[PDB]
Every structure is written in C-alpha cells, then in structure tokens.
C-alpha cells in the first residue's frame, strides 16, 4: 500500500518532469541547425546542453535533493547528466526505425546522425539496445520519473561526501518505486520489473563510461571542443 508520503513523492516527480520535458520540442528551433564529417556536432551539442539544463531543473525538485550540500548536488549532476539524458530520451525514441523522433524530419536522429557527432558503434550499438530494452519494459510515466530520480541520487558516484544522506534519499525513492510496482503495476508486465529497472541503471553506468571515453577523444582536438557549448564543457569536462 502506497503511503500518503509515497503518493506525494510520485505527484511531485511527475509534475517536475512535466515542467522540464516539452514533448512538443518547441525549443529545438533555437539550436544550431542540423546538417546531414562532424556535421551534427553543433546541433547535438546544443541539444545536449539544453537537456543538461532540463535535467538540473528536474533534480532540484527531487524531494530531499535540496537537503544535500551544494557540492554533493554538483557531484551527482555531473556524473548522472549523460545517463538521465539517455533515460529521458527514451520518450522520443521509436522502435519503428531505431531513432529518436523529436517532432519533424530535421529533429529525427538516427545512427548516422550520432556518428556525425563524433561517436562510433562502440557507443551507438549499446545505446540503441538500451533504448530498445527500456522501451520494452513499457514503464508507467510514474516508473520513468522514479528511475530518473533514483539515477541522479546514487551514493556510489565518485566524489560523494555525505553518502549516507544520498542513500537515505535514494532509499525513500527505491521503496516508493517497489511499492508502486506492487500496488499499481498489474502482472505480467510487472514480473521482476524492479530488478529489470535496476539492470538499466547498470547499463547506464557502462554507457556513461564509454560516452566519457569517446567524448574525451572528440574534445581533445581543440577544433572539436570549439563546437560544444560552455555548459557541456563544464559538466562533461575540459
């Protein structure tokens, strides 16, 4: 049974996601234009930078996240940003053609697009498998917003200080998710759903690690990192 506290938590995370994820994608008109050997770097860099801002505005609203010091807040958002971007992007992802469809042909991103941003199959293939496996879980929006929150507030992020507090916040969220699945997700969809969602957090750690390797290699050449944004440089490095 969902406590009043637990229904509260879900209500706040849902509203937080609604206030930070525009499914009309109206702001995409502001990005440097897509061009279809690193011709998608400006556009995708801008997409990413915008998406870091949204993911921060979500994080702030996670009940308890604000009780963390500003230095723990920063550690959690730097390590998780690319993972929450990959998560939250499942919403525009479509298995119809293994692409992210943000509203129009211009803003429909496939394998070739990501490779024209400096990435290789070593990232892209596992990224597509992840998106596919996440879609097949068929999460309730309540589950989706809980997983993003659980992702941000992970006590194992290198650099964390008050791990105990991060863990207590995260536990409150994990417990809410486990109880939500039990009370509101009907079988068979719910079979081992919690363990499948935690698996997706492990897939994201390995995606984060490969994304970091190739980002570092892309951004080594000052000519490429000229095309990023200042927020992207600050959050992802150099």
């Amino acid at each position: 049974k969902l406590s009043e506290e637990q229904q509260h938590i879900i209500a706040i995370l849902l509203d937080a996601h609604h206030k930070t994820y525009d499914p009309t994608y109206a702001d995409f008109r502001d990005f440097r234009p897509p061009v279809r050997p690193l011709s998608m770097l400006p556009h995708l860099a801008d997409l990413v930078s915008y998406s870091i801002q949204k993911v921060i505005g979500f994080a702030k609203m996670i009940p308890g996240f604000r009780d963390l010091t500003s230095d723990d807040q920063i550690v959690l958002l730097k390590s998780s940003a690319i993972e929450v971007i990959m998560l939250r992007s499942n919403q525009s992802f479509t298995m119809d053609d293994m692409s992210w469809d943000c509203g129009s042909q211009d803003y429909k991103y496939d394998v070739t697009d990501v490779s024209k941003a400096g990435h290789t199959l070593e990232l892209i293939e596992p990224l597509i498998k992840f998106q596919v496996g996440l879609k097949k879980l068929n999460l309730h929006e309540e589950e989706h917003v809980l997983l993003m929150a659980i992702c941000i507030v992970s006590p194992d992020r290198p650099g964390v200080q008050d791990a105990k507090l991060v863990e207590a916040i995260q536990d409150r969220l994990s417990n809410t998710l486990q109880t939500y699945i039990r009370c509101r997700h009907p079988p068979p969809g719910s079979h081992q759903l919690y363990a499948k969602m935690i698996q997706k957090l492990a897939d994201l750690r390995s995606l984060n690690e490969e994304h970091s390797k190739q980002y570092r290699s892309l951004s080594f050449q000052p000519e490429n990192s000229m095309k990023l944004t200042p927020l992207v440089l600050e959050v992802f490095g150099n």
Binding site: Q53, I56, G57, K60, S70, Q73, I74, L231, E234, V235
Partner: peptide, 10 residues
C-alpha cells in the same frame, strides 16, 4: 569550479 552548474542549482 562549476559556476554554471552552481548557478542553475540556485
């Protein structure tokens, strides 16, 4: 350190 992140965090 992370002034842009710090600022978005209020």
């Amino acid at each position: 350190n992370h002034p842009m992140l710090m600022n978005l965090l209020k």
